[PDB]
């Protein structure tokens, strides 16, 4: 189940979603990551146990 968890590692705003996708998998221990806008802030969300 791909639990879309907010930016742990990543800071404020996101753009390099390719980086985000690693900065979740490698750093933390998610399946992957992806950038999304929430409250006008692009967060790198991580996606675990997918």
Method: NMR
What residue segments make up the domains of the chain, in order of their start?
1-50
The whole-angstrom separation of Cα 31 and Cα 41 is 22
The whole-angstrom separation of Cα 1 and Cα 17 is 21
> Which strand (E) or helix (H) includes residue 23?
helix 17-25
What are 41's strand-pairing partners? Answer: 38
Q: What is the CATH number of domain 1-50?
A: 3.30.30.10
Contact 17, 45 (CB under 8 A): no
3-class DSSP state of 25: helix
Break-preceding residues in the chain (C–N over 2.5 Å): none
The number of C-alpha atoms within 13 Å of 27 and in the hemisphere containing its C-beta is 14
């Amino acid at each position: 189940l791909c639990n879309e968890r907010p930016s742990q590692t990543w800071s404020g705003n996101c753009g390099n979603t390719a980086h985000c996708d690693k900065q979740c998998q490698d750093w933390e221990k998610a399946s992957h990551g992806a950038c999304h806008k929430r409250e006008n802030h692009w967060k790198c969300f991580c996606y675990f146990n997918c």
